[PDB]
Design a protein around this nucleic acid. Sequence first.
RNA 1: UGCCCGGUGCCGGAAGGUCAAGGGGAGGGGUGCAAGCCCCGAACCGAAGCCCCGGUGAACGGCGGCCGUAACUAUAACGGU
Length: 66
Amino acid sequence: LRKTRLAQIGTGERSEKIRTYNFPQSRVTDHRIGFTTHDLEGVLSGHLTPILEALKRADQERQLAA
RNA sequence: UGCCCGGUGCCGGAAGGUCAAGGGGAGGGGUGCAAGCCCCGAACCGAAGCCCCGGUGAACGGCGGCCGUAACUAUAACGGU
Ligand SMILES: [Mg+2]
Ligand SMILES: [Mg+2]
Ligand SMILES: [Mg+2]
Ligand SMILES: [Mg+2]
Ligand SMILES: [Mg+2]
Ligand SMILES: [Mg+2]
Ligand SMILES: [Mg+2]
Ligand SMILES: [Mg+2]
Ligand SMILES: [Mg+2]
Ligand SMILES: [Mg+2]
Ligand SMILES: [Mg+2]
Ligand SMILES: [Mg+2]
Ligand SMILES: [Mg+2]
Ligand SMILES: [Mg+2]
Ligand SMILES: [Mg+2]
């Protein structure tokens, strides 16, 4: 339970980031794949379905073999 | 060589409360023709001791429980009761 979190959370510093919610530019960016929407209000309201799907397609495009 | 004098001990306290013998003798009783003789007996005065008020530990002794809370988990300096 402990070592697993240190893979997920880690140091929690400004780096190590998975997603930026920069209110100035109304942007939510998943830096690990490059998908960025611009509905920072709807995303924060709970419409995270596109970000999960856009990671889902790049999730099996982690299984591209030979 | 710390904190606790509520209990026990000891020390201090001419007040107060309780308290024996004794003092007191309201008012009762027995007996006698009577004068009397004989018993009972309220209030009230009346020590120490105990009660009561303090002090006292190198006097007898005694020195808690539960719940919550911090940049990973853990822990809890902190808080509540
Ligand atoms: Mg004591
Ligand atoms: Mg005392
Ligand atoms: Mg004492
Ligand atoms: Mg006593
Ligand atoms: Mg004394
Ligand atoms: Mg008498
Ligand atoms: Mg007399
Ligand atoms: Mg008369
Ligand atoms: Mg007569
Ligand atoms: Mg006395
Ligand atoms: Mg006392
Ligand atoms: Mg001592
Ligand atoms: Mg003892
Ligand atoms: Mg004791
Ligand atoms: Mg914690």
